[PDB]
Structures are given as C-alpha cells and as structure tokens.
Amino acid sequence: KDPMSVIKPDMKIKLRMEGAVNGHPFAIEGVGLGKPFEGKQSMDLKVKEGGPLPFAYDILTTVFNRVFAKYPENIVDYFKQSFPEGYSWERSMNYEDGGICNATNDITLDGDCYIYEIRFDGVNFPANGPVMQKRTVKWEPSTEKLYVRDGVLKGDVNMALSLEGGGHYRCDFKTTYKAKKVVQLPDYHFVDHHIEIKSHDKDYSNVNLHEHAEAHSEL
Amino acid sequence: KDPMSVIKPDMKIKLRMEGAVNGHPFAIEGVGLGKPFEGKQSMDLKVKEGGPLPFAYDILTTVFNRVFAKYPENIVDYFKQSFPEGYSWERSMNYEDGGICNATNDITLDGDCYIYEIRFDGVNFPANGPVMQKRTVKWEPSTEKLYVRDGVLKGDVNMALSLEGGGHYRCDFKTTYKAKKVVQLPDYHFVDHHIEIKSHDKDYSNVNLHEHAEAHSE
Amino acid sequence: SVIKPDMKIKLRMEGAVNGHPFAIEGVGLGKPFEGKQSMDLKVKEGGPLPFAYDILTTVFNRVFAKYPENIVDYFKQSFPEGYSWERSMNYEDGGICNATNDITLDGDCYIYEIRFDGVNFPANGPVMQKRTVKWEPSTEKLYVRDGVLKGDVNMALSLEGGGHYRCDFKTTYKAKKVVQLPDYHFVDHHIEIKSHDKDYSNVNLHEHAEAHSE
Amino acid sequence: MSVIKPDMKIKLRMEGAVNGHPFAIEGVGLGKPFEGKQSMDLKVKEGGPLPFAYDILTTVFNRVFAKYPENIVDYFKQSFPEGYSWERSMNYEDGGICNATNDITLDGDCYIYEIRFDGVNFPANGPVMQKRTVKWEPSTEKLYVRDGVLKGDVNMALSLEGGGHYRCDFKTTYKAKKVVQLPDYHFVDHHIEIKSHDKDYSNVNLHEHAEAHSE
C-alpha cells in the first residue's frame, strides 16, 4: 500500500500506443527502463502497424510518465504517491499551424514494470507543413508548469520543436493528471524536461528515446 | 463513372464510431436514411460499448456527411462528386473551457448505402463543466464557411450549445475535407445546418438524430 | 513613500483598429494599497468607435494591485522612476492587439502614454460587431525571465448570447530602475465598465486586483 | 488597366514603434508592375539609429508589383484608381509580434503608402534587438478567399548571423476600396533583398521581385 514499497531505484516500462494522424491509423509498442529518483528513462520503440510512418516522429515522443522526474523533498510528488493504483493523464497539443493532437495514457504497475495504455489522435496537419514533410529535429528543453485547478492536477507548457534549418515550430501543451486513488495534491511548481531521440532507423520503425526531468519550486 | 449514377434520391447509412472521452473508451453504431438532394437525413444510434455514456451526447452528433446537403447549380458539390470512391474528413472541435475533441470520418459507398468509419477523441473536459455534467440542450442552427486554401477544401464554424438554465457554450470547428480521387474544388460558399436529437432514452443508449443542410453562395 | 494611499491618473491612448485611427483621454483615481482604481474615459478622435470597447479596457497599471507583505512588489518598487509595459492580446479568431504603456509619476499623479494597435478582426466577428459583454475575472501569472517581469493569462470575454470569446495575453513589464525581482506569483483581477453612454464616447471604468502566492 | 503603366513610382511614410520606442521612415521608389519588380530608397527620419533589425520592416515597405499571369484574377491591379489596404500580423517564434497596416492610394503615376508598424515583446537578447538577422528566405505566400475576403498566409524565415533561422508566421488581410472580382486560391513567390545600406541603416536600398502562380 505504501507508495515507497512499490518503487525501486530501477523500474521497467512496457507500453502500447494506438493512434491515428489525419485519420491514418498506426500502432507502436515500447520496452524501456528508468530511474524514478534520478528522473531519467530510456526506451526502445517499434512501429507494429501503419509503417513507414508518414509524419514526424517527434509529435509522439512526449506521449511515450512523470514518475520519472526528480522531486525535491519540499514538493509533493503526486506521481510516486499514486502507486500501486497508478494514474492517468489526458493532453491536448495545439500546434501553431492548426494541427492538434489529443493523447491519453493510463499507467498501471505490475511487479517492477509500469504498463502504459496510450491513445494518440492528431488532425489537421497541413500536407505541406513540417510534421507531414518530416522537417522536425528536436524538442527544445522546456519547463512544465504544474498547478491544481478545481481539485485536479494540471500541467501547461509552451513547447518548441526545432526544424531543419531550423528555427522553431510552436505547440501549446495542456495536460490533466488524475490519480486513481485520492492522493495529496501539490502546490504549484515546475518540471524541467529534456527529451531526445538518441537513435533511429531510416523511417523511425525503430527508435531509442531518452528523457530526464527535474521538479523545482521556481522557473 | 458519373457520380450522379451512383446516388439516388433515397440513400441508406451504416456507421460505427469508436472513441474515448477523457480516456474512457466507448463505441456506437448507427443505421440511417437520407435524401441527398433535399439535404435531409435521420438515423438511429445505439451505444455498443462504454454505456451509460458519462458525457453530453451533443458533443457527438455533428460527427454522426456533407452529401446530405442541398447544393444549388452554381456551387460545385465536392461531396457528391467524390463518389463512388468517396471521401474523408478530419475535424478539431475546440470548446471554450479548453475541452477539445478531434474526429475523423472515412466515408465509402456500397450499393445505396454510405458506410462511415468514425474515430472520436475528446480530452480535458472538466468534471464540473456542461459536457461531463450533461447540461447541454441543443446545437444552435449555424452556417459552416467553406473555402479552399492551398489546394484543400476546409470548413469553419463557431458553433454554440444551448445550456440548461439558459446559457451558451461555444465551440470552434475546423474541418478539412479530402476526396479519395482528384475532384474539382469549389469556390467559397456556406452551408446552413440544423441538427436535432428528436428522441432518446434516459441514458442516451438509443438516440434518433435528424439533420437538414443547404449550401448557398450568400 | 512616494506611493500614497490616494493617487490620481491622467492618460492618453493613441491607436488604430483594422487601420482606422482613434484617440482616447482618461482621468482617474486609485488606492494603490487597496488594489482598486476607477477612471473616466473620453473618445477624442475616431468616434464613434466601430469596435468593442472591451478590447481597450485592460490597457487603461499594476501599482493598483494589493500586494501582501510576503510577495515582492515589482511595480511599487519602480517609483518614483516608474515602469513601462508592452503586451500582445491574441484573440481566438485571429484578431491581434499590441499595446504599450509608459508610466511616469508627477507628484500625486500617474501619467500614462499609451499606444494601441489591432489588426485582423473579422468584420463579422464579436469585436467589430460589438457583441462582447465583459471580461471574466481571471488570474495573471507573473514570473521573471531575462531580468524583467512577465505576465501571462488566458482571458475570456463573455458574449451577448452567453458563451465566451477567448484571448491569450502576454505582457512584459520593465522597471526604469533596478528593483528586487519577485518570485513566481499571481494577480487576481476584476475589470468592469460601470457606466457608458450609448456609443462609448464616455466610459467609467473600474478595476480591483490582488496579488497572492498560492 | 489604364491607370497603370509599365513604369510606376512609389512614395511612403511609415510611423511606428518597437517595444514602445517610436520611429519614422520615409521612402521613394520605382517599379514595373507587369514585370513584378520594384526598388526603393528609405531614410530614417525619427528614432535613429534604429535599435532593432531593419529586416522586420522590409516586407511592410504592395502586391501590385507582383507579375500575374492572365489565368489568375489580379485583385491588386483591379483595385485602382481607388486602391486598397492591407493589415498583417507577423508572429515571430520567440513571441515578438509585429502588426502593420498599409493604405495604398494612387496619385498620377505614383502609389502612395500610409504605413503603421507596431512590434512588442522582442526579447533584449533575441536576434531582432541584437540585430543578428541576415535576410528573408525566398518564400511563397498562399492566397485564398475565405468568407468573401482575400487573405494571404506565409511561414517566413530570416537567416541568422552565424547560421540558422528565426521563423515568423505572416497573416495578411487584403481589402479593396471598391468591389473587385475575387480570385481563386493561388500563390505568390517573392524574393526581397536589402541591396545596400549604411552602417546604422539610416539609408537603405531595398529590392523585391514577386510572381503569382497556380499550383
């Protein structure tokens, strides 16, 4: 029952994402591992259906768990607290050219392995835009702002994807986090994050993805 | 194959929607009938999975085919002209309290039946908002603005749900329409529409839905 | 102590909406430690205004926010030298307004020099058709970036028929002297046109604002 | 098409502000409307030396000087003698935003522009206030009619000193002074260059060429 009895310095990850972009369905499975207290993780992802993906893989990567964030003692850690029962999140990602991606993740724990059930649905990406033409290169490191609204935990961030050449293509993230049991809610705070595709094959059928994240009381 | 030879004044509809709202999955199947040249249709919808639905059914009704719109002679009818091959659409529905629904429909034709494969995904509806509390009454009649930008047919409209107690709840609709084959694009125009839930049982597991729609040049 | 319990306001705004120029002058009074103010505004040029007056009201001074003792007050610290701000207001239908205010202090009066420029409001939209009612009370988020203070808020204008028309506000505030920079904090505010004549030639405008930490 | 000659002149005044600091610039130029080419010389009158990248101003300093093939309706040449106006938002990737307007009139063989320019929220360390921009990449404006109104969108990019780009989303609304036949959707290629300037940009020679196309 104690959340600190169902977590270890090293935890495993398994996931499946089912999704569509502009109405074209795809599926991806992942196997990974991370260090919840260091706030680091990595995973290998394989496209199972709908490959070669006709859009920029970067729209997916922030969808592939804030348990993997380093929380100082002085900030309530909603995510580590939620276990063993787990938590879910919902997110809209509203891109500056009108592309919008909705995603959800239901995170459970069995043994030492977090299990993700992910849904991803993106619409209205212009054929000529950086997503459909695969001209993206990386997410700039940024800072999520976490706060409680009407009794739930929210996360907002203005994100920026670096392009070929590159300059930046902007996206507004709005996340809602919901523990499955009643967990003590934190005060407003911040989570720095840095996500990287470390390697991939030509059409991103195979991707090795890394992230690290750290919570803080100020920006 | 002339698009007018694969359509009749009376056509049938079959559909399946698979979806989720705030991460909770559901599925609905529909059978309907419509008069494409009158711009009228109705259908009966049955929840197959995820009932009783915990959200306002009205968020779904506009996702449950512009074939059922009356087009005057001076406006190119992209929708009827896309058959027999058919067409698809993608839409974002951005509600005023931050709730956002994305939807798609892939529309094919088998005999005198249109067949829809629909996906619906809504996120970030607050628990105390009119959608999750089922405080919506109807979509106000409105007018979709159609236009062509960068070789693609689009439709925009600022829709509004009436609420119980008298308020309104606004939603920005942005649709992109794509024919399976290359079809002549129209010039900008408008589609007036009126959508109604004519009957439903208590938990909306059964719903009878009507729409009528008419294109004009204005 | 250059900030008194009762302070006056004089202002001039020059601006344009969709390329059509106008000018407005204001005189007012406020209680900076109580976080309230009111003013009377008069259209001097470009009247009758062909657009919703509500787009202007948040442009017509965070010194009139009540700050508790445990939150660093960037604005009150800035006087006698004062401060300036610039802001973009990006409406959901693509209308965008840019505004600036340069704020000085002359004895007992704050003096505002304001510029306001709005473009791309559709003729058929709520702004050009004057279908807005009021701004909903909301909370600005204030935080430091690059030695200067920022304020962001997702604002909502209620419309005549019920619903809301949204606008993202992004403000940069710049003190004219070195002050202590605050930690992240919030400002609740409530703005209300208390009276106006039919074409808004004359407007009485009220605000109250309060900073908080949580 | 008789109030428009193969050789036309240009006169303009821009009044504006960036981050609250006002400035004013005047310009005199010449162009070939049917060849889609123009140039002008521009002089800073107030607010010099300008403390921001001149490049933010250059696309504000007239689609009459775009070469239109016969098969695309030319909204701009059709506007005259009465003329037209435009309004535009330029939303840069770091949050800096510039709004601009131009009212274009015709006096004999000379187009006259009344321009307003206002930019806010350019960060002190960014490429605009640090004057680290080099030139606008050649791009293509996408023109379309929505709800009876002619609009143009383009994702523009400035190349930066030392490499890379700084992006900007342009959204323009065009408005003829009289009822003019609306075109179908189409594209305008453009290339804009500062060909010469002095050290502080008090003097600038600016060239543009633009061509409309289908597809």
CB D40 within 8 A of CB D113: no
D149 interfacial to chain B (CB closer than 8 Å): no
In DSSP terms, which residues pair with A213 in a beta bridge? Answer: A193
Q: Using CA atoms, how far apart are residues D60 and D12, in angstroms rounded to an integer?
A: 11
Q: Using CA atoms, how far apart are residues C164 and B69, in angstroms rounded to an integer?
A: 29
Q: Using CA atoms, how far apart are residues C24 and C200, in angstroms rounded to an integer?
A: 11
- Nearest neighbour of D166 by CB, restricted to A96, A160, A167: A167
Beta-carbon pairs below 8 A across chains B and C: 24
B185, with CB counted inside 10 A (0-12, 13-18, 19+), is: middle
Q: Which residue of A has its CA nearest to B123?
A: A90
Q: Residue C12: how many CB atoms within 10 A of its CB?
A: 14
What 8-state DSSP symbol labels residue C137?
Answer: P
CB C192 within 8 A of CB C118: no
SS3 at position C27: strand
Selected residue of B95, B170, B188 to mutate for chain C interface (largest C Cβ count, 10 A): B170
Residue C88: which residues within 8 A CB-CB, separation 6 or more? C96, C97, C98, C169, C170, D95, D97, D120, D121
In DSSP terms, which residues pair with D207 in a beta bridge? Answer: D39, D193
Q: Residue C60: how many CB atoms within 10 A of its CB?
A: 24
Q: Using CA atoms, how far apart are residues A150 and C43, in angstroms rounded to an integer?
A: 41
Distance from CA of D114 to the nearest CA of C (A): 10
Q: Using CA atoms, how far apart are residues A194 and C213, in angstroms rounded to an integer?
A: 28
State the amino acid at position B8 in one-letter form: K
Tally of domains within chain D: 1
User: Nearest CA to B89 among B69, B117, B60?
Assistant: B117
Distance from CA of A208 to the nearest CA of D (A): 26
Structural domain boundaries enclosing B56: 1-218
Residues of chain B with Cβ-Cβ distance to A176 below 8 Å are 22, 123-124
Tell how strand B113-123 and strand B11-21 pair up: parallel
In DSSP terms, which residues pair with B194 in a beta bridge? Answer: B212
In DSSP terms, which residues pair with C36 in a beta bridge? Answer: C31, C208
In DSSP terms, which residues pair with A146 in a beta bridge? Answer: A155, A189
SS3 at position C206: strand
Q: Residue B138: how many CB atoms within 10 A of its CB?
A: 15
Tell how strand A40-49 and strand A152-163 pair up: unpaired
C169 interfacial to chain A (CB closer than 8 Å): no
Residues of chain D with Cβ-Cβ distance to C148 below 8 Å are 124
- Compute the half-sphere exposure of residue C65: CA atoms within 13 Å on the CB side of its CA: 26
> Could you tell me the CA-to-CA distances from C151 to A13, C88, D121 in Å, in that order?
39, 11, 11
Asked whether residue A212 is marked as a ligand-binding residue, the answer is yes
CB B126 within 8 A of CB B97: yes
Residue C106: which residues within 8 A CB-CB, separation 6 or more? none
Distance from CA of A193 to the nearest CA of D (A): 19
User: Nearest CA to A96 among A124, A121, A120?
Assistant: A124
Cβ of A152 within 8 Å of Cβ of B23? The answer is no
- Compute the half-sphere exposure of residue D166: CA atoms within 13 Å on the CB side of its CA: 28
Beta-carbon pairs below 8 A across chains A and B: 78
Reading the block at residue B154, the tokens are 């689009």
Task: Please compute Rg for chain D using Cα positions.
Answer: 17
Q: Using CA atoms, how far apart are residues B70 and D201, in angstroms rounded to an integer?
A: 59
Reading the block at residue B71, the tokens are 């087009």
Reading the block at residue A83, the tokens are 């276990």
Cβ of A92 within 8 Å of Cβ of B100? The answer is yes
Q: What are phi and psi of C68, to 5 degrees?
A: -75, 170
- Nearest neighbour of A91 by CB, restricted to B90, B103, B123: B123
Q: State how far Cα A107 lies from the chain centre.
A: 12
> Could you tell me the CA-to-CA distances from C9 to A62, A132, C64, C99, D120 in Å, in that order?
49, 53, 11, 18, 24
Neighbours of chain B (3+ CB pairs under 8 A): A, C, D
Count of residues in chain B? 218
Q: Which residue of C has its CA nearest to D124?
A: C146
Q: State how far Cα D194 lies from the chain centre.
A: 13
**Longest Cα pair distance anywhere in chain A, in angstroms?**
51
Q: Using CA atoms, how far apart are residues D50 and D71, in angstroms rounded to an integer?
A: 43
CB C111 within 8 A of CB C11: yes
- Nearest neighbour of A166 by CB, restricted to D91, D94, D165: D165
D39, with CB counted inside 10 A (0-12, 13-18, 19+), is: middle
- Nearest neighbour of C166 by CB, restricted to B96, B163, B167: B96
Residues of chain C with Cβ-Cβ distance to A146 below 8 Å are none
The dihedral region occupied by D162, where left means phi > 0, alpha psi between -120 and 50, and beta the remainder, is left
User: Nearest CA to A66 among A77, A53, A56?
Assistant: A77
Nearest 5°: the CA angle C72, C75, C76 is 80
Q: Using CA atoms, how far apart are residues B73 and B216, in angstroms rounded to an integer?
A: 10
What 8-state DSSP symbol labels residue C68?
Answer: P
User: Nearest CA to C119 among B38, B147, D172, B62?
Assistant: D172
Cβ of A123 within 8 Å of Cβ of B22? The answer is no
Reading the block at residue B196, the tokens are 């109604």
In DSSP terms, which residues pair with D97 in a beta bridge? Answer: D91, D120
- Give the DSSP per-residue string, chain D: --S--SSEEEEEEEEEEETTEEEEEEEEEEEETTTTEEEEEEEEEESPSPSS-THHHHTT--GGGSB--TTS--HHHHHTTT-EEEEEEEEETTS-EEEEEEEEEEETTEEEEEEEEEEE---TTSTTTTT-EEEEPPEEEEEEEETTEEEEEEEEEEEETTS-EEEEEEEEEEEESS--PPPPSEEEEEEEEEEEE-TTSSEEEEEEEEEEE--
Distance from CA of C188 to the nearest CA of A (A): 14
Q: What residue has token string 């016969």? A: D70
- Give the DSSP per-residue string, chain A: --GGGS--SSEEEEEEEEEEETTEEEEEEEEEEEETTTTEEEEEEEEEESPSPSS-THHHHTT--TTSSB--TTS--HHHHTTTT-EEEEEEEEETTS-EEEEEEEEEEETTEEEEEEEEEEE---TTSTTTTT-EEEEPPEEEEEEEETTEEEEEEEEEEEETT--EEEEEEEEEEEESS--PPPPSEEEEEEEEEEEE-TTSSEEEEEEEEEEES--
Q: Using CA atoms, how far apart are residues A176 and C163, in angstroms rounded to an integer?
A: 23
User: Nearest CA to D188 among D151, D213, D169, D156?
Assistant: D213
CB B93 within 8 A of CB B101: yes
User: Nearest CA to B110 among B15, B186, B194, B37?
Assistant: B15
Cβ of D185 within 8 Å of Cβ of B145? The answer is no
Peptide bond into D6 cis (omega under 30): no
> Could you tell me the CA-to-CA distances from B67 to B13, B36, D66, D214 in Å, in that order?
11, 6, 39, 28
CB A3 within 8 A of CB A106: no
Q: Which residue of C has its CA nearest to D84?
A: C19
Q: What residue has token string 């009932």? A: B51
CB D99 within 8 A of CB D110: no
CB B92 within 8 A of CB A123: yes
State the amino acid at position C72 in one-letter form: V
Q: Using CA atoms, how far apart are residues A61 and A197, in angstroms rounded to an integer?
A: 8
The span from the first CA to the last CA of chain C, in angstroms, equals: 28
- Nearest neighbour of A165 by CB, restricted to D93, D94, D164: D164
Cβ of A102 within 8 Å of Cβ of B88? The answer is no
C162 interfacial to chain B (CB closer than 8 Å): yes
Task: Please compute Rg for chain B using Cα positions.
Answer: 17
Q: State how far Cα D39 lies from the chain centre.
A: 12
Q: What are phi and psi of C150, to 5 degrees?
A: -110, 155
Cβ of C159 within 8 Å of Cβ of B170? The answer is yes
Count of residues in chain C? 214
What 8-state DSSP symbol labels residue B70?
Answer: B
Name the binding residues of C for Cu(2+): 196, 206, 208
Q: What residue has token string 């991707």? A: A207
> Could you tell me the CA-to-CA distances from D120 to B42, C199, D16, D17, D91 in Å, in that order?
52, 30, 11, 8, 10
Q: Using CA atoms, how far apart are residues A40 and A9, in angstroms rounded to an integer?
A: 11
Cβ of B152 within 8 Å of Cβ of A126? The answer is yes
**Longest Cα pair distance anywhere in chain C, in angstroms?**
50
User: Nearest CA to C8 among C78, C73, C102, C103?
Assistant: C103
B162, with CB counted inside 10 A (0-12, 13-18, 19+), is: buried
Residues of chain B with Cβ-Cβ distance to A172 below 8 Å are none
Q: Using CA atoms, how far apart are residues B150 and A24, in angstroms rounded to an integer?
A: 21
Q: Using CA atoms, how far apart are residues B174 and B129, in angstroms rounded to an integer?
A: 22
- Compute the half-sphere exposure of residue B218: CA atoms within 13 Å on the CB side of its CA: 16
Residue C156: which residues within 8 A CB-CB, separation 6 or more? B96, C135, C136, C138, C164, C165, C166, C167
D153 interfacial to chain B (CB closer than 8 Å): yes
B88 interfacial to chain A (CB closer than 8 Å): yes
C88 interfacial to chain D (CB closer than 8 Å): yes
> Could you tell me the CA-to-CA distances from A25 to A19, A50, A127, A145 in Å, in that order?
6, 6, 16, 32
- Nearest neighbour of B92 by CB, restricted to A106, A124, A149: A124
- Compute the half-sphere exposure of residue C191: CA atoms within 13 Å on the CB side of its CA: 26
State the amino acid at position C197 in one-letter form: D
> Could you tell me the CA-to-CA distances from C80 to C2, C103, C104, C176, D123 in Å, in that order?
6, 10, 8, 9, 25
Q: Which residue of A has its CA nearest to C182?
A: A218
- Give the DSSP per-residue string, D17-77: EETTEEEEEEEEEEEETTTTEEEEEEEEEESPSPSS-THHHHTT--GGGSB--TTS--HHH
Reading the block at residue D141, the tokens are 């404006």
User: Nearest CA to B64 among B112, B32, B38?
Assistant: B32
Nearest 5°: the CA angle D10, D13, D15 is 155
Domain holding C164: CATH number? 2.40.155.10
User: CA-CA-CA-CA torsion for B91, B96, B99, B104, nearest 10 degrees?
Assistant: -10
- Give the DSSP per-residue string, B139-208: EPPEEEEEEEETTEEEEEEEEEEEETTS-EEEEEEEEEEEESS------SEEEEEEEEEEEE-TTSSEEE
Nearest 5°: the CA angle B173, B175, B179 is 165
Reading the block at residue C134, the tokens are 């009021």
Peptide bond into D49 cis (omega under 30): yes
D92 interfacial to chain A (CB closer than 8 Å): no
Distance from CA of C163 to the nearest CA of B (A): 5
D184 interfacial to chain B (CB closer than 8 Å): yes
Q: Using CA atoms, how far apart are residues A38 and A7, in angstroms rounded to an integer?
A: 13
Q: Residue C81: how many CB atoms within 10 A of its CB?
A: 14
